[PDB]
């Protein structure tokens, strides 16, 4: 399954938001946020 950023049908922001999500994915920022909010702020360590 996947989580997606949702927009109204026919909205002018759908294509820019999709492209922005793809850019953030390829730059490693999504993985960086995942690590920050799951493991950097984890209370159990490694």
């Amino acid at each position: 399954k996947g989580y997606g950023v949702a927009t109204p049908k026919g909205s002018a922001l759908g294509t820019p938001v999709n492209l922005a999500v793809l850019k953030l994915s390829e730059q490693g920022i999504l993985d960086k946020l995942k690590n920050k909010w799951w493991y950097d702020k984890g209370e159990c360590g490694a």
Partner: protein, 49 residues
């Protein structure tokens, strides 16, 4: 024993902190290194202070 900052950042049995205001806290706040980001997140979210 703890031989580097990585050994501190990996565990949770030993707490660690800095001076409330000074160059060390700002260094950890502004750091972009992953281990120092982990340390800064822990120290900022640590309770009690």
């Amino acid at each position: 024993p703890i031989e580097s900052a990585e050994d501190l950042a990996k565990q949770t049995e030993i707490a660690y902190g800095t001076l409330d205001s000074g160059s060390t806290k700002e260094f950890f706040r502004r750091s972009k290194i992953a281990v120092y980001e982990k340390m800064w997140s822990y120290m900022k979210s640590a309770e009690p202070s």
